[PDB]
Amino acid sequence: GLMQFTLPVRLCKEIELFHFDIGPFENMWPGIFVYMVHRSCGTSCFELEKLCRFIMSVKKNYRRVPYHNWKHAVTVAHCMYAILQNNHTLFTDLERKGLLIACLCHDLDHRGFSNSYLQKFDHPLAALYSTSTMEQHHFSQTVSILQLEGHNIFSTLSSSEYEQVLEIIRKAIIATDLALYFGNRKQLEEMYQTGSLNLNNQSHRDRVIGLMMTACDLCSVTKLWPVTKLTANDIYAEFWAEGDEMKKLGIQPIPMMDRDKKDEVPQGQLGFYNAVAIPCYTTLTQILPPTEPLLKACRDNLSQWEKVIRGEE
Ligand SMILES: Cc1c(C(F)(F)F)nc2ccc(CCc3nc(N4CCCC4)nn3C)nn12
Numbered sequence: 001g002l003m004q005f006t007l008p009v010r011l012c013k014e015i016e017l018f019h020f021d022i023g024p025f026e027n028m029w030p031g032i033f034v035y036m037v038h039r040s041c042g043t044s045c046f047e048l049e050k051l052c053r054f055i056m057s058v059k060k061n062y063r064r065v066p067y068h069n070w071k072h073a074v075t076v077a078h079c080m081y082a083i084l085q086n087n088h089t090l091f092t093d094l095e096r097k098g099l100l101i102a103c104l105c106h107d108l109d110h111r112g113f114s115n116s117y118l119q120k121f122d123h124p125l126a127a128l129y130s131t132s133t134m135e136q137h138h139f140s141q142t143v144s145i146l147q148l149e150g151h152n153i154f155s156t157l158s159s160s161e162y163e164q165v166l167e168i169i170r171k172a173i174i175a176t177d178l179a180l181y182f183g184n185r186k187q188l189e190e191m192y193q194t195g196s197l198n199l200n201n202q203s204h205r206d207r208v209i210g211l212m213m214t215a216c217d218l219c220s221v222t223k224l225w226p227v228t229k230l231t232a233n234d235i236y237a238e239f240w241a242e243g244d245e246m247k248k249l250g251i252q253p254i255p256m257m258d259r260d261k262k263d264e265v266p267q268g269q270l271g272f273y274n275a276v277a278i279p280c281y282t283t284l285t286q287i288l289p290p291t292e293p294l295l296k297a298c299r300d301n302l303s304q305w306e307k308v309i310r311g312e313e
């Protein structure tokens with residue numbers, strides 16, 4: 001009850017900034033996450049015994065893949081922590097509780113393969129869920145871990161509050177299917193610009209939280225250049241493995257996933273920043289002005305890839 005978590009001074013300070021890296025010591029990520037729940041939600045949101053037990057069960061169910069791993073989960077949760085703290089009065093007691101959990105859980109049991117690879121391989125999960133295949137698997141794994149004895153971190157919530165919070169986590173986790181983002185951003189664009197955007201319309205919050213989820217999920221482009229550059233290695237290491245698997249089933253993989261097309265990486269990073277990240281963080285800054293630093297940071301990294309193309313590094 002009176003048991004704070006505290007972080008070394010550098011982490012206590014740097015953790016409040018959007019571009020914070022959680023570092024290479026796996027063993028402190030749980031402490032960091034708790035620390036964020038406590039400052040973000042209150043020391044009373046969750047029973048410490050149950051939360052710790054849930055954190056460690058979630059960790060166990062992420063896999064040793066290059067990118068979509070436990071470090072991605074806590075990274076995505078920290079970006080969300082930063083958004084919540086720079087917009088504190090805008091979000092319900094329940095939304096604060098659910099969204100940090102949604103980010104931790106959003107890639108549960110990822111195998112390092114896209115929805116398309118499950119479909120082309122004919123993986124059972126593609127039969128169970130026709131669209132947002134892995135994302136419905138992710139929500140599913142969240143509910144599994146929430147039902148393990150001693151893991152109900154929501155046990156204090158009323159019947160209806162519990163259903164509302166699980167429904168926030170469901171839509172939150174679905175929204176991380178980037179195929180849905182393009183349409184989600186476009187509507188939020190129109191709504192903002194015609195002045196029809198209304199945060200009391202629950203279907204408008206849903207979209208806004210959706211965009212926040214894309215923003216957190218992509219936050220690896222909003223870090224200091226050396227962190228962004230090195231993460232891209234992990235991202236490409238999964239995609240090229242999926243490329244190899246595609247060739248195994250007798251399919252030319254899209255160039256993104258062809259390791260033979262290593263050389264066009266900086267050109268592909270440009271496309272991605274221009275077609276995906278820049279728009280994401282633009283619309284998000286318009287809707288939530290204190291998130292501007294994600295946009296500024298994203299721009300800087302775009303500029304760093306331009307420098308790579310021109311052989312300035
Ligand atoms: C940095 C990053 C993130 C995140 F935000 F999460 F960090 N999420 C993604 C998703 C895709 C990509 C690769 C972009 C791309 N590469 C290519 N290739 C063609 C031939 C060689 C390169 N085409 N495209 C579109 N990066 N990425």
Ligand SMILES: [Mg+2]
Nearest residue numbers: 106107176177
């Ligand atoms: Mg995902």
Ligand SMILES: [Zn+2]
Nearest residue numbers: 106107176217
């Ligand atoms: Zn993710």
